[PDB]
Nucleic acid binder design. Sequence first.
RNA 1: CCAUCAUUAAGUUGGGCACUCUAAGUUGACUGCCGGUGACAAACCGGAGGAAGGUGGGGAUGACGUCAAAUCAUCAUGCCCCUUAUGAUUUGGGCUACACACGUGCUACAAUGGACAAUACAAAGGGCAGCGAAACCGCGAGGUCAAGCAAAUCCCAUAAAGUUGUUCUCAGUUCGGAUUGUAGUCUGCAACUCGACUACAUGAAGCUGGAAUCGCUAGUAAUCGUAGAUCAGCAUGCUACGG
Lengths: 152, 80, 127, 104, 60, 97, 202
Amino acid sequence: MPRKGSVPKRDVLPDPIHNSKLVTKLINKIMLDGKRGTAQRILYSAFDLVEQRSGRDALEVFEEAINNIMPVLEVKARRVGGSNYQVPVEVRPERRTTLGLRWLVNYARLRGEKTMEDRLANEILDAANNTGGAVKKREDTHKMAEANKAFA
Amino acid sequence: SIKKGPFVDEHLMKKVEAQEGSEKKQVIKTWSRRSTIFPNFIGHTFAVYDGRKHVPVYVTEDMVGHKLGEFAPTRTFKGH
Amino acid sequence: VEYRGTGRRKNSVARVRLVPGEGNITVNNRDVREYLPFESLILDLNQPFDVTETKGNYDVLVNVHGGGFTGQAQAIRHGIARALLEADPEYRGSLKRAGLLTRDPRMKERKKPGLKAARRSPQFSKR
Amino acid sequence: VDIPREKRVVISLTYIYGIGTSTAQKILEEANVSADTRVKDLTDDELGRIREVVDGYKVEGDLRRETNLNIKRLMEISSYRGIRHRRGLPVRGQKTKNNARTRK
Amino acid sequence: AKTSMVAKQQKKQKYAVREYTRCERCGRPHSVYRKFKLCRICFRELAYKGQIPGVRKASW
Amino acid sequence: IRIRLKAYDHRVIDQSAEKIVETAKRSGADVSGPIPLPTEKSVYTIIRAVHKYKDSREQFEQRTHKRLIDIVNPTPKTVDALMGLNLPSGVDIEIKL
Amino acid sequence: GQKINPIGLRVGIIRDWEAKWYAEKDFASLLHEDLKIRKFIDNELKEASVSHVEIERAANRINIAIHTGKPGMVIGKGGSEIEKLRNKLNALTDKKVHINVIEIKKVDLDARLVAENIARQLENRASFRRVQKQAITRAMKLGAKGIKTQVSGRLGGADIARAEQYSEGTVPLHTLRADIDYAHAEADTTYGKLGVKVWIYR
RNA sequence: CCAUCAUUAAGUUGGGCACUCUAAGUUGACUGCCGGUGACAAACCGGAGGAAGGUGGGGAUGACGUCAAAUCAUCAUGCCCCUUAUGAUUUGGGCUACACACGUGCUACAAUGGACAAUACAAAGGGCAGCGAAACCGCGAGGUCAAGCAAAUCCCAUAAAGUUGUUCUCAGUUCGGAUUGUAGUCUGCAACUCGACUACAUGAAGCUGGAAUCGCUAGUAAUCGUAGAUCAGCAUGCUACGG
């Protein structure tokens, strides 16, 4: 479910090591039941591979990715019914796609095993300078609705 | 639902010295599957009891190492 | 405190025997790095714990009780919480809002069957 | 007799028809199928030592070796309470219905 | 059909795996707690007859 | 263990667990008696069927705890702290010693 | 009408518990000795119309605790019925010497067991308004807490009860520690059930 | 139930260390209450006393009304018929069915971990020969019979898992664990019917299972379960509540 509607959602909290919640929501993808016994180690064998393969830490070269994931500016429209009616729109952190955590670039875990131990280290570093790769964090949430001109 | 008491009949085992040494009857008021099976149950007859009547099912010489409990066919399953 | 000072959270009692001096890992005097290889639940409570510098002011010496294994620990922080008003009043500015001053944030919110929280409908029959 | 080399051997007998709860319980758990064998894992005397586990009746698809067909005579009792594998889709009076559904 | 087939365990009965150890004054033959020999809800009904003390809620 | 002379909640066990402090000081002994403990409860295991209709639940409370107090140090002439008659007939005063 | 049957209303202040029972051994037979004896006095007290339930077993020196304060039925004359039960109810309880009784003060004010006092006001179905049901109009306005009245006992074969209302008014109507109970009895509808649901308000 | 009393066995015993943990009831609680944009049309927020926060928060009962909806195969029965059985009764059978359309409680393909033991702990709730600890009887079952005092404790229990560290390289691999002689092992003439031990001679699938189905936001699931009442010899079900 109208008469009623829909209102914003929840989010996450940083960590005392780097003061970053970008690592936190990624652990919350895997935060087993409070028993993060080596889900901690799986996170620290996923998130470190952008700070390691790319020399700079979570705030400079990882910022090339984590300036662009859950939003300040995303694609969205208003109450216009069943038409196209598309324009670019500024947004808040309520419903989320282009500054901190959301959709495409960064499937850490999508290579040729059925593992979590080493698979997260496999497909991780593709969000070095925000260049695609595989579906976890951003890329494809920027290029939606700018097509038809003549026979539109 | 217990595994106690390897039980030959204990009242009809008194008669099984004459019904397994000899053969047991074919269609009589019997059950023909509880009393355990062993390779000394060879060449005898017995009557399995569903309720229609005690239909003969034999107790042959290959009867050594199997067990019982559809001692009357509870389903006659066919159904669908 | 040499009495039943308020060290108690998430199924924990504490006889916080406040011996002046060492504030260390006095949860049965062990470590948590690969014993809790999760390694996430101990040092995160630094805003209440470490701010007053009760690492060379007072011990906790907690007497522990309650909570299945994934439930009990982290209660030495509340053992030193009511100590902090008598161990080190160095960071009493933030404990009125949240810290060692009043109470504990999270604890055993006893199992409410048929709901989890706040408008959910997770992947049961619904979403 | 024909256990696999070049890798671990504890996948030799775990999932073979005829032998069950001695495959991974008596031929690998009680007996020895090697669990850390490389391409060179003493395949000069160890290979011939572990071939006495292949010498009983009808083993693992090797139907003249170890295991299977002593229940052959037992097959003819006109009986129910061993059908769980003696007759190994268990149709021993239990369900193959909507939800009784895990194994076979 | 009136009174005394329920009286099996009232008299000495052979097999109480059926468990006619029940409550008092209603319909339950088989599969509940143990006290007054034939019912289900009487473990609270008759228990509120001075056997055992009372019961509260206060206001969620 | 868990006081109950036959009074259970603290509009009546504010009499029972409050007279534990006093009735424990009745007659011959030098006891170490009153020990206010945690509580105990009792659930009415019932549903409402004979064949089918069952399954309802709501908000309980319950208490009845008959005591064990550690009154085991008697003095048979100096009436101090054991053996005063404390309502044993109507009140089911089951104070284990 | 899709209603469940209540017993306890607001228990925690107003509703209380009269559990004083000590017959600890033989929960199969000694429990029977004090519960099955409750299946006995439904007939003899001659339309008792009684107050409430106050049961008590005095440390297994059981003197039977059911008052039914209409005098004469349980009194006799200076220990006739009570002393007679001293020898008779030795089969009920252990001794049962000099069974007790109280005086009933406007028994229609008692919330729970008034249901007999009104089941014996219309079950006759013959001059069932004045000769018997005078007391619905006598026991009206002594200021009881639970203000709810209905009657359903064999009026044409009725399978439901009755109510009366008018309309106005203002109040802060929320109160959380009242006292009231149920009522349900054994009239014969002969085709489709109705055990009479019967209360009044004082 | 030591923090130091000493005669720390901590006989937690002499007293009473034992103020505390111990075992902590009462009543602290109640935005009882200030500043407000609160404009008063107020309390809650900001605060701030409270052990608890704004009811501190929950665990049985639900109107005016009863669809009489499973149950005359429960009892008090309206009613009959059966009155040498439709009562039945026994045990001879099974009633736990056996393609089932559906279903659910308990499952592996893990590497936070497959086996091993521990890290240790238990709330629970039980007892009248108790648990079976303790030796015991075990990778498999787990008796043996007293143990403990009728149990503040005692036994349960090494509970266990989580974790230590791997075993393996995330396969279909000690994955993982049914089947027939099993012992009839715990066991009563009568289990093999009408359990399983993981154990030996006995594979049951499976690639994260498809879209769907359908439970879980805090000692609960996950981690796994420990006691109790049915079990006249049958639990995974159920209830009490745990590291």
